[PDB]
Design a protein around this ligand. Structure first.
Ligand code: NA
Lengths: 57, 5
């Protein structure tokens, strides 16, 4: 099956070519050098952390 | 959580 990892923070947001929202994910137990852009539809129960990002930007 | 790809 496909692998899930704990999210510490949402640090940024962009639109891809296709128009889909991508989020820059800080992974819990890792630092910024390991942040990755993930499709919105890769995020599980991250609504509160998307709220926090939107409040900070 | 997120799928990492
Ligand atoms: Na990197």
């Amino acid at each position: 099956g496909e692998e899930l990892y704990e999210v510490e923070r949402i640090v940024d947001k962009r639109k891809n070519k296709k128009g889909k929202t991508e989020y820059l994910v800080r992974w819990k137990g890792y630092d910024s050098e390991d942040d990755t852009w993930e499709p919105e539809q890769h995020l599980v129960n991250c609504e509160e952390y998307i709220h926090d990002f939107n409040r900070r930007h | 959580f997120a799928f990492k790809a």
